[PDB]
Amino acid sequence: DIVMTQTPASVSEPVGGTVTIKCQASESISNWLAWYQQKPGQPPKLLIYAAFTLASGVPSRFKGSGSGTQFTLTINGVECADAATYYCQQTYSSRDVDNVFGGGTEVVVKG
Amino acid sequence: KCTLKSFTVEKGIYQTSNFRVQPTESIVRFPNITNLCPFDEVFNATRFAS
């Protein structure tokens, strides 16, 4: 019933820039939202839950913004250590849903 | 007699009251709609918005 898409497919920007990711919904999901990061050969880890609250032990560089339909994940500064795939989870209604998580967005940092 | 509030009425023509044929039966007409409104999916939703 709920379907999402994650854009961009991939990003690339030097060490001093800011990388941003859009997670948009077919219909509004309110604040209910979560952002996940997996290193290669590593299970994903929660970074932003409720679309605003920082997780535990995560540095204060990842910003979640937006509410309802459009959500943005913005990183103030990269250090070539956040080069991984990020996903957004609906965590709102999963009665008949093909995938709670969205598309994959791999971050590439050229240092 | 009741209208005049008297037990004797003089010869003449008096207008007493009115008459109106009462309705026979009742009908109600609504469009041929059978789908029930999605109150369940809104009220019985597991999680609500902020």
Specify the amino acid at residue B6.
Answer: S
Please give the backbone phi and psi of residue A65, each rounded to the nearest 5 degrees, phi first: -140, 165
Q: How many A-B residue pairs are in contact by the CB < 8 A criterion?
A: 13
Query: Cα separation of A52 and A92, whole Å?
Result: 15
Interface of B with A in 18-47 (CB under 8 A): 45-47
Query: Cα separation of A56 and A43, whole Å?
Result: 16
Chain B interface includes A99 (CB < 8 A): no
Count the neighbouring beta carbons within 10 Å of the beta carbon of residue A24: 15
Q: Do A28 and B47 touch (CB under 8 A)?
A: no
Q: Which two tokens stand for residue A68?
A: 């309802």
Domains along chain A with CATH numbers: 4-109 (2.60.40.10)
Element (H, E) at B39: helix B39-43
How many residues belong to chain A?
111
What determination technique applies here?
Answer: cryo-EM
Which residues pair with residue A19 across a beta bridge? A75
Query: Cα separation of A53 and A40, whole Å?
Result: 25
Q: What is the DSSP string of A41-56?
A: TS-EEEEEETTTEE-S
